[PDB]
């Protein structure tokens, strides 16, 4: 997260770190046995780490569970990152409490202007690589569709939205992909891509979760 602040230990209890010897993406807990992340964060050997804050120290509250299966959206396009969503099922269920809780899926899409919280252990520099130890947060709004499309002509589909600041300075960055964008207590986005981090007029693009709720629901119901 570039230009964000330290969330404070376990203040984002639905945030998960996907680990394969190190942290490579974030994700969101939506129920006791399922996480939602981004399709390009797919790999085998994923351990989902819950109740974290410093990802390099065991501080207590952590639950480490292995993924039983990951489901990449079938129409995921790696060249356009259209449909960049993935569901990970956990081997056993997580123990929910005040430090590990899930987040509700939206019933309606959010409107431009809506302010949301984006979190993650990603890079904090736009020009360089500095990965933090504890979780970072950034409050950013959803932009209108015309600004998004005017920033990324020909690269935004209806399953994507831009959120951020056009003046630059604040944005999600690498290490944040897969993580959440929660607005009014509903998961409205997943960190998907961007051009650099915190650059001027190049806001971050997020996968539009309101467009996948029936799919998340039906897939989870059948697996
Ligand atoms: O996410 C990502 C990755 C990556 C590839 C494959 C698996 C896991 C991660 C590699 C490089 C960069 C990124 C990435 N860049 C980026 C930029 C923004 C932004 N500027 N808003 C958000 C999220 C990411 N991820
Ligand atoms: Ca830790």
Contact call for residues 71 and 152 (beta carbons, < 8 A):
no
Look at residues 145, 184, 153, 181 and name the one whose alpha carbon lies nearest to residue 4: 181
For this structure, is 147 an active site residue?
no
Structure determination method = X-ray
What sign does the CA torsion over 56, 128, 80, 77 have?
negative
> How far is 186 from 108, CA to CA, in rounded Å?
9
Q: Is residue 218 exposed (0-12), middle (13-18) or buried (19+ Cβ within 10 Å)?
A: exposed
Binding-site annotation: residue ranges for substrate: 171-172, 174-175, 177
- Selecting among 53, 84, 176, 192, the annotated active-site residue is 84
For this structure, is 53 an active site residue?
no
Give 146 Cα–ligand 1 centroid separation in angstroms.
23
Instruction: Identify the CATH class of 1-12+103-210.
Output: mainly beta
> How far is 193 from 205, CA to CA, in rounded Å?
5
Look at residues 145, 119, 149 and name the one whose alpha carbon lies nearest to residue 16: 119
Contact call for residues 60 and 106 (beta carbons, < 8 A):
no
Q: Is 177 in the pocket of ligand 1 (CB under 6 A)?
A: yes
Helices (H) and strands (E) in the chain, counts: 2, 13
> How far is 90 from 69, CA to CA, in rounded Å?
7
For this structure, is 214 an active site residue?
no
Declared resolution, Å: 2.0
**CATH topology classification for 13-102+211-223:** Thrombin, subunit H (2.40.10)
Residue showing tokens 């081997």: 91
Equal fold, 1-12+103-210 vs 13-102+211-223: yes
3-class state of residue 36 by DSSP: strand
Look at residues 196, 192, 214, 209 and name the one whose alpha carbon lies nearest to residue 80: 192
* Residue-range domain boundaries for the chain: 1-12+103-210, 13-102+211-223
Residue showing tokens 């990802």: 55
Q: Is 174 in the pocket of ligand 1 (CB under 6 A)?
A: yes
């Amino acid at each position: 997260i570039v230009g964000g602040y330290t969330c404070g230990a376990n203040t984002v209890p639905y945030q998960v770190s996907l680990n394969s010897g190190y942290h490579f993406c974030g994700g969101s807990l939506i129920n006791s046995q399922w996480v939602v992340s981004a399709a390009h964060c797919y790999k085998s050997g994923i351990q989902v780490r819950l109740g974290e804050d410093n990802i390099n120290v065991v501080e207590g509250n952590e639950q480490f569970i292995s993924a039983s299966k990951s489901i990449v959206h079938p129409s995921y396009n790696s060249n356009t990152l259209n449909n960049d969503i993935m569901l990970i099922k956990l081997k056993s269920a997580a123990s929910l409490n005040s430090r590990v809780a899930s987040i509700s899926l939206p019933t309606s899409c959010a409107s431009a202007g809506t302010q949301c919280l984006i979190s993650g252990w990603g890079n904090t520099k736009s020009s360089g690589t500095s990965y933090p130890d504890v979780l970072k947060c950034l409050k950013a709004p959803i932009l209108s569709d015309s600004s998004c499309k005017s920033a990324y002509p020909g690269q935004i589909t209806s399953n994507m939205f831009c959120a951020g600041y056009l003046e630059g300075g604040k944005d999600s960055c690498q290490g944040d992909s897969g993580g959440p964008v929660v607005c009014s207590g509903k998961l409205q986005g997943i960190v998907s891509w961007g051009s650099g981090c915190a650059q001027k007029n190049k806001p971050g693009v997020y996968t539009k979760v309101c467009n996948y709720v029936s799919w998340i629901k039906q897939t989870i119901a059948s697996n």
